């Protein structure tokens, strides 16, 4: 009945304590901390208790203990972009943003491809994409799918291109 990181207490449904209620085993996660600006391995029990307690500076990177690589690197780029996202969809341990679909069968945030982006009323950005001298206007979903693809681009300013 109770949500992730929570525990039943006297008909209430309160958060868990990371240092008291996680003496059992749980799978290792790789997590990032905005304050210290370092990532580290953490038990899933402690991480979910922290997110119940609104530790917004703590972000999910990937399942298992930390391994450097592109997937870890992209996890750090997600965190810097997450302030620009209006969707904050819970998805397993992760939180999916405007440029991602929650894959329910795997509990993984999966980056959309650019043509899947619903423009709607998303915030626009003027950008230049590498090896070119022609500005283009992109919304935040589009920008996120491009960074996820590891594609060369530079943002120039918020809002549509003035040209």
């Amino acid at each position, epitope marked *: 009945h109770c949500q992730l990181g929570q525990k039943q207490s006297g008909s209430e449904c309160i958060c868990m304590s990371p240092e008291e209620d996680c003496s059992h085993h749980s799978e290792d996660l790789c997590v990032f901390d905005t304050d210290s600006n370092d990532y580290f391995t953490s038990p899933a029990c402690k991480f979910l208790a922290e997110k119940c307690l609104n530790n917004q500076q703590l972000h999910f990177l*990937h399942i298992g203990s930390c391994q450097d*690589g*592109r*997937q870890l690197e*992209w996890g750090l780029e997600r965190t810097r972009l997450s302030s620009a996202s209006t969707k904050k969809e819970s998805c397993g341990y992760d939180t999916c943003y405007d440029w991602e*679909k929650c*894959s*329910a*069968s*795997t509990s*993984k945030c*999966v*980056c*959309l*491809l*650019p*043509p*899947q*982006c*619903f*423009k*709607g009323g998303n915030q626009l950005y003027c950008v230049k994409m590498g090896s070119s001298t022609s500005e*283009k*206007t992109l919304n935040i979903c589009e920008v996120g799918t491009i960074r*996820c693809a*590891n594609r060369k681009m530079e943002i120039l300013h918020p809002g549509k291109c003035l040209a």
Partner: antibody
Amino acid sequence: EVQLVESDGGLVQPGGSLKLSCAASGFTFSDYYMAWVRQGPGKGLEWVATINYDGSSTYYRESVKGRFTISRDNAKNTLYLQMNSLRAEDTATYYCARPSTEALFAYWGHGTLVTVSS
Amino acid sequence: DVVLTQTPSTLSVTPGQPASISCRSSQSLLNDVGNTYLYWYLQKPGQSPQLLIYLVSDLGSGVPNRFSGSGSGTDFTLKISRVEAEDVGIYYCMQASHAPYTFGQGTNLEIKR
């Protein structure tokens, strides 16, 4: 209900021209990319072109470049495919498609038959 | 161009029985961030294709849950647990992991009687 209705296909002699149209309703047309997909007599499926929201960016299958042009008119809620220098291997049923957050080709029209023949 | 080669090209299934269709890719569809853009479509006779499975194993909207997908890398599989008459048609796999987008040649599903 999302709805896509292709038309302006039909018979065209080889080397002739055709401009397909696809009328969209049931959603905000200018909020989405659009694509054309075709199915030849062998019943294989083949992506043709994609267009971004306002037509400032277009993408094309390599066998089609320099011959087809994807365009749109968001005031009329219509997707187009100009097709020049038509070959017999372009004979197919052409569908317009709209993506979703699940897939690239989520919603499909019923298609318009293009027959290239003398 | 990534070539998707489906197997079998035809299969006959009694209603109520399960069915399995495989899709072999000439190149791995897993990318360097852990995502795999494989999809399954059904084209019933006289109709346009409709989505069944997205991202290997996620079920499309309005699709019955007797359809499932699985696999990784280059080998992927669609499964129908209990076939019904309305599932007759041609089943296609599609990849969007490497441009241009490509489909499989299709697998015909016959109702065995």
